[PDB]
Amino acid sequence: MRGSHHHHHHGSAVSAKIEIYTWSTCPFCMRALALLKLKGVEFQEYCIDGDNEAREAMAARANGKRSLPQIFIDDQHIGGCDDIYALDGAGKLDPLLHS
């Protein structure tokens, strides 16, 4: 195991689970994607263009909301584009991404 390794009872290596549901061409989705990309974090985008079934799966997790985008971090519903930008402006987004 050659390398410079961090030990703190981590056990199996896991990380933040970051999810965003989008339409690719929605300007609010595009703005939220830009913010996540600028943070440099690894994240999963559920691009659901034209997919009603996926929108209903999204709504089932997002308090019935079908507005876009919808963002989850470690399985918690964060909200939409305005919500993530508001958190960042308050200095509260970085801690949630783990930093």
Curated annotation (Swiss-Prot):
Has a glutathione-disulfide oxidoreductase activity in the presence of NADPH and glutathione reductase. Reduces low molecular weight disulfides and proteins. It holds the Pfam family Glutaredoxin. GO terms for biological process: cell redox homeostasis; cellular response to oxidative stress. GO terms for molecular function: glutathione disulfide oxidoreductase activity. Belongs to the glutaredoxin family. InterPro entries: GLR_AS (IPR011767), Glutaredoxin (IPR002109), Glutaredoxin_subgr (IPR014025), Glutathione_S-Trfase_N (IPR004045), GRX_bact (IPR011900), Thioredoxin-like_sf (IPR036249). Keywords: Disulfide bond, Electron transport, Redox-active center, Transport. This is Probable glutaredoxin ssr2061. It comes from the Bacteria. Disulfide bonds join C26-C29. It comes from Synechocystis sp. (strain ATCC 27184 / PCC 6803 / Kazusa). One of its GO terms (cellular component) is cytoplasm. The keyword Transport applies. PANTHER family: GLUTAREDOXIN 2, GLUTAREDOXIN-1-RELATED. Gene3D superfamilies: Glutaredoxin (3.40.30.10). NCBIfam families: GRX_bact (TIGR02181).
